[PDB]
Every structure is written in structure tokens, then in C-alpha cells.
Ligand binder design. Structure first.
Ligand code: IJO
Length: 129
């Protein structure tokens, strides 16, 4: 897309060691599945196109972008070694939302609803077997 948006996060790299764990399978099959289909998922399902949204400062402020489309592709591509890397991606996505926007903005309310659901799902994350 536009040269004024940054390249999206890596989802493929043969040099990075990879594993499928039961925890990672739960993150794809339960956690991402639940969040992806939520009514409030859509602002999070792809990278922020700061040109289309007329937010030229967005990637001045947000230096660690992350979105659920990227996490979905990471999971589908078995990009991770462990669940914590994936949980960290989710946490980064929510934190970016809360940094860029204001308390009570619609996108913040949406992120808070998703994050509550995410926390419930992570509380049920199985032990790594
Ligand atoms: C209006 O601000 C934002 C913030 C994010 Br994160 C995504 C889209 N718009």
C-alpha cells in the first residue's frame, strides 16, 4: 500500500525456530476464534491505515504496531515458539489502542470489551503439555 504506512509486522521467517504447542493451538482455536468473530473485532482485524484514516501522527506515536490480522496469520503460519509471544502480541495491540486514543472513545470501549474476553480466555489457558 502507501509508502506512508510502515511495512506490516513479520509473519514468516524460515530462520526463526517454531513450534506448535497445545497452548498455541488453544490460542488459535479458542482465543483468536472467539475474539475474531466478536461484534467489536473489526477495528482490530487489520493494520491501521493511517493514510486512509487521515491520522498522519499514528506511526509517530505507535512504534510497536500489532493487529489481530497479523496475530491470526502468525498463528496460521505457526510463527511462534511459545504462547507468551502470542499473548504479548495481543497485549501490544490493546496497549497501542489505549495509548493512541482517549478513555471512553468508541475504539477504547471496544478494545476494553475484547480485552476482558481475552483475559477470561487466558485465565483458562491450559498447562503446556
Ligand atoms: C481513531 O483512532 C484509531 C486508533 C486505532 Br488503534 C485504530 C484506528 N483509529
Amino acid at each position: 500500500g502507501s509508502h506512508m504506512n510502515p511495512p506490516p509486522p513479520e509473519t514468516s521467517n524460515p530462520n526463526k525456530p517454531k513450534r506448535q504447542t497445545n497452548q498455541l493451538q488453544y490460542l488459535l482455536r479458542v482465543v483468536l476464534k472467539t475474539l475474531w468473530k466478536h461484534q467489536f473485532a473489526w477495528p482490530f482485524q487489520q493494520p491501521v491505515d493511517a493514510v486512509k484514516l487521515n491520522l498522519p501522527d499514528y506511526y509517530k506515536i505507535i512504534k510497536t504496531p500489532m493487529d489481530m490480522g497479523t496475530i491470526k496469520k502468525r498463528l496460521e503460519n505457526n510463527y511462534y515458539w511459545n504462547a507468551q509471544e502470542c499473548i504479548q502480541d495481543f497485549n501490544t495491540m490493546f496497549t497501542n489502542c489505549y495509548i493512541y486514543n482517549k478513555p471512553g472513545d468508541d475504539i477504547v470501549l471496544m478494545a476494553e470489551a475484547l480485552e476482558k474476553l481475552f483475559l477470561q480466555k487466558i485465565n483458562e489457558l491450559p498447562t503446556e503439555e
